Design an enzyme around this catalytic site. Structure first.
Site, PDB file in Angstrom:
ATOM      1  N   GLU B  39       0.798  -1.216   0.000  1.00 36.96           N
ATOM      2  CA  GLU B  39       0.000   0.000   0.000  1.00 36.96           C
ATOM      3  C   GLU B  39       0.837   1.276   0.000  1.00 36.96           C
ATOM      4  O   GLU B  39       0.268   2.373  -0.056  1.00 36.96           O
ATOM      5  CB  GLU B  39      -0.949   0.012   1.208  1.00 36.96           C
ATOM      6  N   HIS B  58      -0.599  -8.236   7.187  1.00 33.18           N
ATOM      7  CA  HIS B  58      -1.195  -7.348   6.194  1.00 33.18           C
ATOM      8  C   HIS B  58      -1.288  -5.935   6.760  1.00 33.18           C
ATOM      9  O   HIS B  58      -1.233  -5.729   7.978  1.00 33.18           O
ATOM     10  CB  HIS B  58      -2.617  -7.787   5.783  1.00 33.18           C
ATOM     11  N   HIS B  85       2.114 -19.812  14.003  1.00 30.46           N
ATOM     12  CA  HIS B  85       1.458 -20.410  12.848  1.00 30.46           C
ATOM     13  C   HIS B  85       0.089 -19.798  12.594  1.00 30.46           C
ATOM     14  O   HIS B  85      -0.748 -19.715  13.500  1.00 30.46           O
ATOM     15  CB  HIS B  85       1.310 -21.921  13.062  1.00 30.46           C
ATOM     16  N   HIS B  90      -3.056  -7.507  11.151  1.00 30.55           N
ATOM     17  CA  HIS B  90      -3.567  -6.707  10.045  1.00 30.55           C
ATOM     18  C   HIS B  90      -3.583  -5.221  10.363  1.00 30.55           C
ATOM     19  O   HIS B  90      -3.753  -4.807  11.516  1.00 30.55           O
ATOM     20  CB  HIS B  90      -4.989  -7.128   9.661  1.00 30.55           C
TER      21      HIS B  90
END
Lengths: 104, 167, 121
Positions: B39, B58, B85, B90
């Protein structure tokens, strides 16, 4: 990559949309049938064992669906994400909530 | 722009690291880990943190947190932070030093203060987690009420997290 | 959120290949989706029997022993198995099942999003 994987007697209609990483595996005595207008969401695994798995017309399968055994998923039914169907069927226009588990 | 890998950092060649990401010294990115800052949003992973196989980081296009270097970041992961894991970090997000994030748990648009232990199959969202608190497995934390009433990390619970990574 | 909706999304693969690291011994009729991660530490091995399918985004990580997926067992996408585990014959594991040092009876079925974790065996 965009590819799915099939093995055994799998027949798919031409306008079916199949997401990436889908597995469509039919054992030797058994088969998979996917009618037209169907969408199989990402990662879904369908595995016919003692007979046919039929996905009928315009049904939608969300991501992470698992279908095992024998089953008919009725015309235009919708299966929520992560739905898990083992030896159980969906009526036409039926709907499963995400994360639901139907098993016999 | 490209990511910056500290030469003293071990990043698996099958891990995927896209964009404006800062990988500090001694940071261990395992196989199949996904870090994506496509982004134009900066990412910083502090020293000696561990990202396990299947973890994923993310970032939202809009939104930032304030890093300890005074820069604005989409994602700031502190030092000695364990992201295990299949766990997800985000968007605008801040993890303190010595944070643990258990299996398949999500941290999104939130602040996790240092020393905190997040368990498995959990979501923390829209909250400033106090330093040193423990969210049980399966918990869903979206209100700041819920945050305020979180158990503090039992000297037991940091053993469990210390077993999950054992290297 | 509806059931499993708080859990992370299920991401697409980047390759058409899965990745093994450790001691794994694979069965010719096994089907492994791309992006599955079979990891076995030095003290450890993964063993997958005949007719198994492992769905997209799954991660098998053997630690302190073996993980054994027995024949005809099936794993939906994003199943996670850490520790040592034996998944029974013909078992079925819903999407985003987690098994941590816990095993499954043959024919047993796991609801999607299930979280099964013991400390150590």
């Amino acid at each position: 990559s965009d590819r799915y994987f099939a093995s055994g007697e799998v027949t798919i209609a031409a306008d079916v949309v199949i997401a990436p990483g889908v597995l469509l595996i039919a054992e030797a005595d058994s088969r998979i049938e996917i009618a037209s207008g169907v969408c199989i969401g990402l990662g879904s695994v369908i595995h016919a064992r003692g007979g046919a798995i039929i996905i009928q017309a315009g049904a939608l399968l969300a991501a992470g669906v698992l279908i095992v055994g024998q089953s008919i998923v009725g015309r235009q039914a919708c299966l929520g994400a992560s739905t898990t169907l083992v030896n159980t069927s969906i009526e036409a226009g039926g709907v499963t909530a995400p994360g639901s588990l139907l098993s016999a | 722009a490209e990511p910056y890998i500290d030469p003293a950092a071990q990043v698996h060649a099958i891990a995927s690291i896209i964009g404006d990401v800062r990988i500090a010294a001694g940071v261990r990115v395992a196989a199949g880990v996904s870090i994506r800052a496509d982004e134009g949003a900066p990412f910083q992973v502090g020293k000696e943190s561990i990202l396990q196989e299947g973890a994923v980081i993310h970032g939202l296009e809009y939104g930032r947190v304030l890093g300890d270097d005074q820069a604005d970041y989409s994602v700031w992961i502190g030092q000695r932070v364990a992201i295990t894991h299949k766990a997800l970090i985000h968007g605008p997000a801040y993890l303190g030093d010595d944070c643990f994030v258990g299996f398949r748990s999500t941290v999104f648009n939130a602040r996790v203060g240092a020393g905190s232990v997040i368990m498995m199959h959990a979501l923390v969202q829209d909250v400033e987690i106090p330093p040193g608190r423990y969210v049980p497995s399966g918990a869903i934390i979206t209100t700041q009420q819920q945050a305020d009433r979180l158990p503090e990390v039992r000297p037991e619970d940091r053993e469990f997290a210390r077993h999950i990574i054992g290297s």
